[PDB]
Design a protein around this ligand. Structure first.
Ligand SMILES: COc1cc(Nc2ccnc3cc(C#N)ccc23)cc(OC)c1OC
Ligand code: NA
Ligand code: NA
Length: 369
């Protein structure tokens, strides 16, 4: 009834679990853990700052906010202001969180099993593995720099600059952004939500097929909408992957076949990419190909697509159906599906044929060249 309380002790691992799971009470549990004011004591955060930035770290700042704005899976964000006035956000890891992951995961699963809340061991290792990748804040900083360079001059999106002097293996600092995360934007008007989600799906297509450099686990909590500028700050860099153009090219042939309602080509190309073995049980394979074709439905229609009902987690969870499998077996579906799910959670509606034809057209222009 109040597993929430004991889960708040491992709220980081529970959050990561909920982002993978997307019984009904368990969602309410996770939603309450997420919405909990329970945060890691300041004293533990100070140890990371001292270890990483030196005992004099506070001298670099005029202000350090002791209550975090929000907690991540392995750290929390504290707002602050540098000497001179430059406002920043400082994402700070829990001390030795890397060595606490296995215990935190075991604790989370124990609480969920003993409470009879969870009716797969290999997926638990996926949880451990994903939390460990999140610990690499040096890499995350490098991905933020590269995305900022790729999106230079965009009229809608921006990436806050990294503050190198406040970055370390366990601390990532950016300039402050003015706005709020998209998990608080459900109450915005339909036109605004449509415009946000349109731009997000276009960027998804550019990340996959143009940049070959992409965030593969989209989370609406990591996009910030600035209502005044009418812009979105991108802070979602945790699972960023670069792929060879030959790999995303095969993926665009899948989406092309799904848009064209060519179920057999979707299946053949899926086998070629090693997403399917070719001898899966047909019932599961069919449900998986059904979810792909839902993606094609959107990209095949000049009429507005109703993400709120047509691409809900119910209709698209088979994009990735239940030793863990290689990440390259599902990262692109997780990206496409995750982007559709953001459109669905914000109840967006807009036509998608134009944006896919532009992406596919660029693909064809290069193919002839
Ligand atoms: C999701 O990932 C991150 C999120 C943040 N959050 C923020 C950044 C910049 N301004 C903010 C303003 C407010 C306000 N009011 C709240 C949060 C902000 C910071 C990060 O790094 C330092 C992240 O890690 C890449
Ligand atoms: Na984290
Ligand atoms: Na840059």
């Amino acid at each position: 009834e109040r597993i929430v309380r004991t889960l708040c002790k491992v709220r980081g691992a529970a959050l990561k679990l909920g982002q993978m799971l997307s019984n009904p009470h368990l969602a309410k549990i996770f939603e309450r853990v997420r919405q909990s004011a329970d945060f890691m004591p300041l004293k533990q955060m100070m140890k990371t700052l001292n270890n990483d930035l030196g005992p004099n770290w506070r001298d670099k700042l005029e202000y350090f906010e002791e209550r975090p704005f929000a907690a991540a899976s392995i750290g929390q964000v504290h707002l602050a202001r540098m000497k001179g006035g430059r406002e920043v956000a400082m994402k700070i890891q829990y001390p030795g969180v890397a060595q606490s992951i296995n215990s935190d995961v075991n604790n989370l699963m124990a609480v969920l099993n003993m409470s009879n809340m969870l009716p797969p061991e290999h997926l638990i290792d996926v949880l451990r593995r994903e939390l460990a990748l999140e610990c690499d804040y040096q890499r995350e900083a490098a991905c933020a720099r590269k995305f900022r360079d790729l999106l230079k001059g965009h009229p809608f999106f921006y990436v806050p600059e990294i503050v190198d002097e406040l970055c370390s293996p366990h601390v990532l600092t950016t300039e402050l952004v003015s706005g709020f995360p998209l998990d608080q934007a459900e109450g915005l008007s339909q036109e605004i939500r449509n415009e946000i989600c349109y731009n997000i799906l276009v960027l998804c297509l550019r990340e996959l097929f143009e940049f070959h450099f992409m965030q593969t686990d989209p989370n609406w909590s990591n996009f910030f909408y600035d209502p005044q500028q009418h812009k979105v700050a991108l802070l979602d860099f945790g699972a960023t992957r670069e792929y060879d153009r030959s790999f995303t090219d095969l993926y665009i042939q899948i989406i092309r076949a799904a848009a064209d309602r060519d179920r057999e080509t979707v299946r053949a190309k899926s086998i070629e990419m090693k997403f399917l073995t070719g001898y899966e049980v047909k019932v599961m394979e069919d449900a998986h190909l059904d979810a792909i074709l839902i993606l094609g439905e959107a990209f095949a229609s000049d009429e507005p697509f109703d993400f709120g009902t047509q691409s809900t987690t119910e209709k698209i969870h088979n994009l990735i159906p239940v030793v863990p499998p290689p990440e390259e077996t599902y990262s692109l579906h997780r990206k496409m599906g995750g982007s559709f799910l953001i459109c669905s959670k914000l109840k967006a509606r807009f036509p998608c044929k134009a944006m896919f034809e532009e992406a596919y057209s660029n693909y064809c222009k290069r193919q002839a060249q």
